């Protein structure tokens, strides 16, 4: 087509979605991790994670307001990834990289899994 | 902080939100324009438009599944703007610029209003 494009649009949209998350506006699901609860928007979770995409496209699960993750999932690793989903920023540190990579593999967040693999390989 | 950032994350999120819109997945509102209906996600509309932000933060309207726009609003202008919300791409043409600007002013989409004003000024 002959469209024009606003460079900062996608970033501004994500920033506003994160402001709605902060203020608990229109959040429609609770993600339960080892008895730690995280409120979010199903559409943002689906847009970021192959696991959430599969969960909320399921005809029965699409209607659930609570999702319980596998007990092996670390709440801090999940929190870091949820922040990444809403900001594009990943708080990757020596002390959390293993939990973050394991959580990203479970959530099916391929780009996160990729940078974790590379950061681990650099330290070996 | 000491975060790393994935450059394409915001764009990939918006692309996936538009794929959900295309497939009518988790859309939670119908926008009615001069008897033309558009299905969308409330959170994306709020992230893009000051009008939708005000509508869906209202304690009564946040729960509506149908929103009727002012009868002066042109369905094509709305359609072009809804596409812009989900893609960052604006199909601005000599034949639609007046309807698009009028719709962007009503929806409170300041960056769109700005490029319409500039494109109109260049043709005078």
């Amino acid at each position: 087509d002959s469209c024009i494009q606003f460079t900062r649009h996608a970033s501004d949209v994500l920033l506003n979605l994160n402001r709605l998350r902060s203020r608990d506006i229109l959040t429609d699901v609770v993600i339960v991790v080892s008895r730690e609860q995280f409120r979010a928007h199903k559409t943002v979770l689906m847009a970021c994670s192959g696991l959430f995409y599969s969960i909320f496209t399921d005809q029965l699960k699409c209607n659930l307001s609570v999702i319980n993750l596998d007990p092996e999932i670390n709440p801090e690793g999940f929190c870091i990834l949820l922040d990444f989903m809403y900001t594009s920023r990943l708080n990757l540190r020596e002390g959390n990289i293993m939990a973050v990579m394991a959580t990203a593999m479970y959530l099916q967040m391929e780009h996160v899994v990729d940078t974790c693999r590379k950061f681990i390989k650099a330290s070996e | 902080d000491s975060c790393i950032q994935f450059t394409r994350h915001a764009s990939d999120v918006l692309l996936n939100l538009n794929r959900l819109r295309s497939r009518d997945i988790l859309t939670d509102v119908v926008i009615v324009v001069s008897r033309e209906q558009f299905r969308a996600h409330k959170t994306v509309l709020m992230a893009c438009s000051g009008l939708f932000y005000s509508i869906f933060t209202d304690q009564l309207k946040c729960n509506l599944s149908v929103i009727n726009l002012d009868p002066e609003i042109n369905p094509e202008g709305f359609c072009i703007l809804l596409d812009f919300m989900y893609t960052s791409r604006l199909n601005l043409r000599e034949g639609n610029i007046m309807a698009v600007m009028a719709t962007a002013m009503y929806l409170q989409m300041e960056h769109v209003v700005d490029t319409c004003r500039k494109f109109i000024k260049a043709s005078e």
């Binding site: 469209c3 024009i4 494009q5 606003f6 460079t7 | 791409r89 604006l90 960056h111 490029t115």
Partner: peptide
């Protein structure tokens, strides 16, 4: 705004 840009030409994509």
């Amino acid at each position: 705004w840009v030409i994509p």
